[PDB]
Amino acid sequence: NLFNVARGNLYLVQTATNGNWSPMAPVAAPPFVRGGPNVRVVGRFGTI
Amino acid sequence: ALAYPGRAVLPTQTKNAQFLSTAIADRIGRLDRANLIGGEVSAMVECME
């Protein structure tokens, strides 16, 4: 992190929060993981 | 782009994209570069295209 490189994955949820916020160290729980319930992995090329 | 249908970008459900999504990924480029001498041109490459 001293060399402007972050480890770990990246979330793109929205939140309309007014209070404190920190993308570096989010105190709250992650919204989901890869093997979790109702979550699904996209295939190759993201075909809509 | 015409050489390598495996390198296609498949944005939407094109009917071509219905076919090109079935493409096995490691079926592309060279497979056996049968070279003999380092620094000299390879004798016989073996590529899928």
| Closest CB from B9, B12, B21 relative to A48 | B12
Check if B10 contacts A (Cβ < 8 Å): yes
**Which amino acid makes up residue A36?**
G
Tokens 């160290």, residue located = A25
Bridge partner list, B47: B30
In units of Å, what resolution does this entry have?
3.4
Length of chain B: 49
**Residue B7 CA: distances (Å) to CA of A4, A8, B1, B30, B32:** 32, 28, 7, 14, 20
Provide, as residue numbers in chain B, all residues whose Cβ is less than 8 Å from the Cβ of A46. Answer: 11
Solving technique = cryo-EM
Rounded distance between C-alpha atoms, residue A38 and residue A8, angstroms: 22
